[PDB]
Amino acid sequence: NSGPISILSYCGSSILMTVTNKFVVNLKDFNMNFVMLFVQSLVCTITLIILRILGFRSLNKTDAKNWFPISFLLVLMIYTSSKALQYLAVPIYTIFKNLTIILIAYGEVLFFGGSVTSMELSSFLLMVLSSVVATWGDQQNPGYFWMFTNCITSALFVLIMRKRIKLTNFKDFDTMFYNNVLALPILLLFSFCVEDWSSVNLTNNFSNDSLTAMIISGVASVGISYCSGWCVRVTSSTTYSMVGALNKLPIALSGLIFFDAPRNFLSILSIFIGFLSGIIYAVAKQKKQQAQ
Amino acid sequence: NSGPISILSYCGSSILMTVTNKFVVNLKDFNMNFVMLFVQSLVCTITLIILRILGFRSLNKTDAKNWFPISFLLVLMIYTSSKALQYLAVPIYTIFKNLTIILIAYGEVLFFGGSVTSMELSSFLLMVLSSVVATWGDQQAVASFNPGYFWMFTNCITSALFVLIMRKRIKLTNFKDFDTMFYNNVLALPILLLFSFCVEDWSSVNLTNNFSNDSLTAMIISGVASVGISYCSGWCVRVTSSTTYSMVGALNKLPIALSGLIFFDAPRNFLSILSIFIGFLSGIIYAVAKQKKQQAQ
Ligand SMILES: Nc1nc2c(ncn2[C@@H]2O[C@H](COP(=O)(O)OP(=O)(O)O[C@H]3O[C@H](CO)[C@@H](O)[C@H](O)[C@@H]3O)[C@@H](O)[C@H]2O)c(=O)[nH]1
Ligand SMILES: CCCCCCCC/C=C\CCCCCCCC(=O)OC[C@H](O)CO
Ligand SMILES: CCCCCCCC/C=C\CCCCCCCC(=O)OC[C@H](O)CO
């Protein structure tokens, strides 16, 4: 586990999680989003514990209270992100979620000090265009405030995890385990603070059937769980933040091939612009090694 | 005459020419652009000879047939723009004309061999955003769409083939300013009358009534201001870089657009403003890029 294998790994799970959540679990637009994530991180936790007794990990209290900010950034990342999409459109959220990419690249400079290649700067802007270009080819204040929060919480999150990982020599699995376990409590705070619970009404909603999807989702979410922390650790907090935005293209590109859906050339340019953005960013990484 | 002083000259001239064509001569959208522009190239021609005898330039036959493409490239650059602008909105025309900056920067690779700094690449992409961002912040048979984009594809290359070749033949023929100004004005004058019959419709019973003593007087007014840009356009490309002239020219319209928000109580859009300040960022990156290029060697 090192090198570009991280990125190919992150794809299959984000590819698996996108398909599986839309093919395996049809209409996963549940009443309580955090509960699905609570299981996705809980089914992930159980899966690891089964693996410890068949051979991976460790348990501390010194590292423990230093990771809680990361998890708290995660759930807040979702709460802010979840709240952004309530008042915001999907394409524009990508634009700001793509604008977050830049600061994350320059946020790594404040945690590790590296320089942002002028070529890397070009790639991110192309995603911005590919983001805007796609946005300009579609239709549909409260939102922007939460997106201003998602941009920062998603940044401080992916940044800090990468910090504490290399600080506590957290090998993979270790990253996965702590993020799954420590998020479990915080989700119950936001699950109780945000969702509506009613034993008269919702106790019937997520019945014996629905949980099958939430656990099915968790098993598929196992991939993304392990690979996210593996990507940030080996490569860069920028690399993980970039691949996440790039993934939706082959998924979006798959949506145009595998589907007879009304399209627009503007939408296509965005996807191919995003594809270009990777090539520049892919080559940009090359110029860092060769130059130095 | 050298260095960034060129840019202010090309800027001030493009700015003075913008006002003079829009405030002093309102409805500068004439029925026959080539004749209006033919005068602008004639007053420059007339203007130059008076200075030729008051002190700058030269006339050849070896230079002549190597310069004819520029005037033809120059006038053709306009005809494509005029015909492109018929089917396209002002902001969208801006986007592609800013995309030519990329090829022009990379067209220089085919003409002189310099490298396009990744930092330079950043600016050009940003210019796209300030252009793209503004377009998304605006209002306005398929076979009617495409005719514009088609005419724009030619303007983009002729706009490239134009400023590119001139800068080469300029540095090849040591064309000092005026020479750049003179030759493009002189050799273009005939082509302008060429396009005058090729495009315009003439009717002395009807069109003779259009260009009256007011409008006819105006056609000279615009040329008087265009003396700057004419001398400064070729001055800009020569001293700095064929990219710089293609960049500063695109940069100029920001402060004029910024004037529209300040000097005017006009409905605005934050997107429009973001675009403009995005453009300023575009310059600063390009300014540093030029700064990092000269510093390196
Ligand atoms: N470290 C860690 N990360 C996790 C875990 N579980 C989920 N994540 C991460 O939480 C994020 C949210 O999950 P996804 O729904 O898979 O998001 P996505 O595929 O990355 O897509 C995002 O960008 C798209 C545009 O490119 C958007 O369309 C999408 O809505 C979302 O914002 C992802 O980055 C995922 O890797 C876990 O246990 N641990
Ligand atoms: C509602 C909209 C809200 C506002 C939307 C804003 C969009 C901002 C876009 C791009 C910013 C790019 C910033 C680039 C800063 C670079 C500074 C720097 O340090 O550059 C060094 C680099 O190496 C030089 O190549
Ligand atoms: C509304 C439309 C918006 C769409 C906008 C689309 C822009 C695409 C145009 C040009 C790509 C220019 C990038 C060319 C690739 C540069 C490669 C490079 O610099 O390579 C150096 C390499 O490392 C060897 O040294």
The greatest distance separating any two alpha carbons of chain A, rounded to the nearest whole angstrom, comes to 65
Structural element, H or E, at residue A212: helix A210-234
> What's the token pair of residue B61?
């036959």
What 8-state DSSP symbol labels residue A205?
T
Q: Please check if A245 is assigned to a binding site.
A: yes
Of A118, A129, A135, Cβ closest to residue B117? A118
Q: CA–CA separation, A26 vs A217, rounded Å?
A: 11
Distance of alpha carbon B107 from the chain centroid: 18
Resolution of the experimental model in angstroms, please? 3.6
Number of C-beta neighbours around residue B215 at 10 A:
15
Contact check, Cβ <8 Å, A136/B136 = yes
> What's the token pair of residue B118?
């990744």
> Which chain B residues are closer than 8 Å to A122 by Cβ?
118, 121-122, 125
Annotated binding site of B: 243-255
Angle at A82 between CA A81 and CA A88, to 5 degrees: 80
Of A117, A132, A284, Cβ closest to residue B136? A132
- Torsional sign, CA B158, B161, B164, B165: negative
What separation in Å is there between the alpha carbon of A121 and the centre of ligand 2? 9
Say how many CA atoms lie within 13 Å of B206 toward its Cβ: 4
Token pair 């330039």 is at which residue?
B57
What 8-state DSSP symbol labels residue A202?
G
Q: CA–CA separation, B186 vs B59, rounded Å?
A: 10
Best mutation target among A102, A118, A136 (most B Cβ atoms within 10 Å) is A118
The SS3 assignment for A228 reads: helix
Ligand at minimal distance from the CA of A22 is 1
A89 lines ligand 2 (CB under 6 A): no
A13 lines ligand 1 (CB under 6 A): no
> What's the token pair of residue A98?
């793509």
Contact check, Cβ <8 Å, B126/A125 = yes
CA B133 vs CA B68, B125, B183: distances in Å: 38, 12, 38
Ligand at minimal distance from the CA of A120 is 2
Q: CA–CA separation, B13 vs B23, rounded Å?
A: 15
Number of C-beta neighbours around residue B87 at 10 A:
17
Q: Where are the domains of chain B?
A: 1-297
Contact check, Cβ <8 Å, A135/B136 = yes
Structural element, H or E, at residue A2: none
Say how many CA atoms lie within 13 Å of A234 toward its Cβ: 16
The SS3 assignment for A93 reads: helix
Number of C-beta neighbours around residue B295 at 10 A:
8
Please give, one letter per residue, the 3-state secondary structure of chain B. Answer: CCCCHHHHHHHHHHHHHHHHHHHHCCCCCCCCHHHHHHHHHHHHHHHHHHHHCCCCCCCCCHHHHHHHHHHHHHHHHHHHHHHHHHHCCHHHHHHHHHHHHHHHHHHHHHHCCCCCCHHHHHHHHHHHHHHHHHHCCCCCCCCCHHHHHHHHHHHHHHHHHHHHHHHHHHHHCCCCCCHHHHHHHHHHHHHHHHHHHHHCCCCCCCHHHCCCHHHHHHHHHHHHHHHHHHHHHHHHHHHCCHHHHHHHHHHHHHHHHHHHHHCCCCCCCHHHHHHHHHHHHHHHHHHHHHHHHHHHC
Among B119, B121, B130, B275, say which to mutate for ligand 3: greatest number of ligand atoms within 8 Å of CB.
Answer: B121
Written as one letter, the residue type at B297 is: Q
Number of C-beta neighbours around residue A50 at 10 A:
8
Q: CA–CA separation, A41 vs A37, rounded Å?
A: 6
Ligand at minimal distance from the CA of A281 is 3
Closest-CA distance, B289 to chain A, in angstroms, reads: 10
Task: Count residue pairs from A and B with Cβ separation < 8 A.
Answer: 36
Contact B40, B270 (CB under 8 A): no
User: Which residues in B have their CB inside 8 Å of a CB on A?
Assistant: 117-119, 121-122, 125-126, 128-129, 132-133, 135-136
CA B267 vs CA A112, A167, B18, B130, B264: distances in Å: 45, 53, 21, 18, 9
Closest-CA distance, B156 to chain A, in angstroms, reads: 19
A236: closest CA among A112, A75, A100? Answer: A112
The greatest distance separating any two alpha carbons of chain B, rounded to the nearest whole angstrom, comes to 64
> Which chain A residues are closer than 8 Å to B136 by Cβ?
132, 135-136
B38: closest CA among B191, B208, B182, B259? Answer: B191
Tell me the Ramachandran region of residue B142: left when phi exceeds 0, alpha when psi lies from -120 to 50, beta otherwise. Answer: left
Best mutation target among A116, A117, A122, A132 (most B Cβ atoms within 10 Å) is A122
Distance of alpha carbon A4 from the chain centroid: 18
